[PDB]
Symmetry: D3
Subunit: 146 residues, 6 copies
């Protein structure tokens, strides 16, 4: 039984993130999105990820606390997956202390420039980033600025 | 049925490569090492990979020709795996033309500086790189310089 | 009528910045330096830029607020110019939301290591950075530490 | 009268290149594409660029020989423009010897992974890169492999 | 009389740091570790460095204040040494204002991923980083979390 | 007795190289420039380095053959010094096989863009790079193109 954890703060989840979720889900038996404890509270973040991933039956969303590698090993998962040198440092640290591996996958070109932080700053100053975020995020983003 | 292809020229295979093979084998149901058509001939390269991977029951070694993505899709595998911006270019090109994904994994620190080319040049000028290569490679390396 | 905006916090403006201003001014009909809202207050920053750019007749200095791309398009300018991957992210975000282009130009070698932040920290601890800053900045820098 | 030269071997011209041509043409009075003296011969390269740039009235295509900065200054142009550290080295060398400036612009995300060399290798091995190249190039590419 | 200063906050000193100290000590007549004014207080930091460097007779530990280049020149030392673009900026700034040179040395592979900050965060959340830190640091680390 | 080897092909030696030689000479008791076996023949290369380094009494020029680390250890020197990730690979390989350390030093800003290859190509096509090369090189460069 193969499994990958996709960790992050997801504040908010982006289409870049969902693309990674989709590709992990295609390769591993199970995917767990670990929301690691900002603009949106934990509950909102979870909802937004769930609402954006209904098309991924083998994906589960879960709040995480502490070391990501503890999360991975506790839930019997087998790997961390994340989208793309700082990560390099963490991946090797994570292999050192817990034997957990990290698989990196390149961003789809069209999402190469979107980040949660940049989306937030642009949204707050009146820019349209709705093409870079899931509709569940867009919906909540509109409501929080209105 | 999940599966990863580990492509390369493997001239010769290094311990860095074997580490990647090992980690792919731990996460995917099947691994195919694709030796893509130099110092060693094709037969030698195959042998060296096979001799170095006997401890990986779900790994298979195979010569490859043409686009790696054709190789992946023909053998029903689901992903390319390789050890680590040029790769970025290829991974996105490979996703564009064939929908094949590429998962990157960081080198173990102790193998961070070993490459087939550098090992060859150092070996040929009398340096000891045997700690960076599988014994089946070391054996053949000694014999080819003697 | 061609035009470039050179945005930044300019706290303070450096000779690296002025070099970029000079090269933009040489290529575009009009240049607007946008001081985006620290050590010096807004008024000081403006003055320092103006005092350092009197030799550039087609350059104008202006305080900016909000998205830089709003500033560009509102003033009918046609491009952002700045001196040199984070910028890459912003440039593509800025092209996405407003269609505004960003042209990057390499620092003159002699100013490759000067930044506003580094100049400030070195100046405050007693180091001589006057060769890296315009005399109007040097003048005000001396007075603020004395 | 402002002007930019877009230099390259353009063997063949890509949609990434055309995007750069388009953005240069939008900012400078005149653009000269300098084809610097491979798969396609000079004549083919010119044709392909011309056929792909008919929608750019202020763009001119011209074969170049020798230093790009000689080309720039001889034709009274004022700047080099190209799409994006090696370039950094050349830009500073070009500023040193001829006072010519280089403005860099980020690739559109969708063309971030396309290069002439990679397109050629993928095309020759049977991959479909027609979405990354102008139809005039696609046409000639089909005919040269058929 | 040759001499190198190894500057840093050393909060705490790591085995990566000690490796650099060792290599500097092997090449220069004298080494001064400059602890530049966090988890451990100044006294603890000093102790930890001293306890970890008893095997280096020509190494001295000293608190530093102000510009590192003032420290270098005041103590008649001749160079800064540190383990490895931000450093590039500082090294050139330091050469500009004080004529002090900086020699960089590559991390040993096995310590490539260890940093004071990352070690602290991992230690605090229950991870075992004792293989990456000197025993004098490990001892104090255990006691501060217990 | 401390000592550094500065290895390279020096075809030709540049002012960037001489700057590194100067800084090594200032920190180590002895410096050996190792010319590792192109435009200029071995004899010319030696001459050019010698003619450009007469002001460095503790510097010696010598042809090298084989592994640089063999050269270092044979001549009882203690370190490799060179001006600045490929180097990273080699430095760690060189530490692995021979225990030889490599100290990197940043280029002076004004020589950041000069390389032997780029100087040659620019010189051959009629560009003036004499400000980037020692007069002994300039002299020979003029004569070889005339
Ligand atoms: C890293 C990231 C963030 C973030 O860290 O805030 C938000 N989106 N993405 C992203 C992920 C994969 C591909 C593209 C973008
Ligand atoms: C890339 C590479 C080569 C090569 O490309 O020649 C030889 N070993 N490795 C390697 C692979 C994974 C980790 C470390 C090293
Ligand atoms: C980026 C920058 C800053 C800054 O961001 O603080 C201050 N100077 N420069 C600079 C600009 C162009 C060339 C060299 C230096
Ligand atoms: C550099 C380049 C090549 C090449 O160098 O072969 C072919 N296309 N592009 C390109 C240019 C701008 C944007 C994207 C791609
Ligand atoms: C930079 C660094 C830190 C830090 O900056 O916190 C802690 N260790 N190291 C280190 C130094 C040399 C080699 C490896 C690691
Ligand atoms: C690397 C190099 C070359 C070369 O490799 O050809 C020629 N000069 N330099 C150089 C060395 C130190 C500083 C600046 C430049």
């Amino acid at each position: 039984m193969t499994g990958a954890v996709c960790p992050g703060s997801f504040d908010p989840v982006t289409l870049g993130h969902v693309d990674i979720f989709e590709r992990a889900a295609a390769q591993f038996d199970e995917v767990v999105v670990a929301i690691l404890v900002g603009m949106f509270d934990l509950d909102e973040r979870i909802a937004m990820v769930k609402e954006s991933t209904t098309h991924l039956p083998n994906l589960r969303v879960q709040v995480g606390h502490g070391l990501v590698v503890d999360f991975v090993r506790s839930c019997g998962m087998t790997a961390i997956v994340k989208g793309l040198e700082y990560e390099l440092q963490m991946a090797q640290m994570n292999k050192h202390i817990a034997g957990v591996d990290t698989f990196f996958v390149a961003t789809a070109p069209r999402y190469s420039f979107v980040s949660s932080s940049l989306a937030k700053e642009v949204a707050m100053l009146g820019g349209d980033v709705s093409e870079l975020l899931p509709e569940p995020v867009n919906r909540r983003l509109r409501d929080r600025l209105n």
